[PDB]
Amino acid sequence: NEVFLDVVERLSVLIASNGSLLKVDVQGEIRLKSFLPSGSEMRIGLTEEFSVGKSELRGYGPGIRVDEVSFHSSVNLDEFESHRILRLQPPQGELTVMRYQLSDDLPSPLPFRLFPSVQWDRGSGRLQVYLKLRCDLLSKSQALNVRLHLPLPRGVVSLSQELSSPEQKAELAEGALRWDLPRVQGGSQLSGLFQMDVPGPPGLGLGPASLSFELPRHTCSGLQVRFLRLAFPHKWVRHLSHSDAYVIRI
């Protein structure tokens, strides 16, 4: 039978207008789906490295770590301290095996950096917004369904846009720019120039930008499942990060 094990991490970030990281949050889970014969016992091995918490004695350094961890009540932790192995007899269907959280710097660079340039004629109503997005993932790695949402001043309309590659889409809707970038890889640099008209009052507020995306074959924390072993079967072990709150001030 089939067994699915997914490490899934929700990333939230707040980045300042100068590019400084103000806040980073990772909420992670390890989710299982399986329908194994009676008797079955499963062992999951995680990154052998990894530390948990902020030890007052040892401190915390570079390396793979989470700030806190919690486990399903059915999980046996006899081999967790020595070997980072979890043991359980799963139910039929879905189970969340482990949850964890991280609020410190990530072990790799943040996946996206934005370089906005805004010129505002107070004036003639002319607003020019140039956005450059750089993907800082490894060059082999992909970001899927990337969308940038940018709230705009009340009553703004679009005069023109120039997008840096033809697969990109952008429109204004509900008072915000929505810019979709379906092709994004580590090292990509994608840009859009938007000419808008801002009406005078009857009769800012630009930003912040919020990115949403999925990062297949990736964890923000660096945590990984090393093995999945069954004792009595096709296995899928997947690692994914995603955000709907990757916020960047303009």
């Binding site: 961890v69 919690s70 486990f71 399903h72 009540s73 932790l77 969340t96 949850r99």
Partner: peptide, 7 residues
């Protein structure tokens, strides 16, 4: 030592 949840 460890925190557990039921769901």
């Amino acid at each position: 030592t460890y925190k557990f949840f039921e769901q």
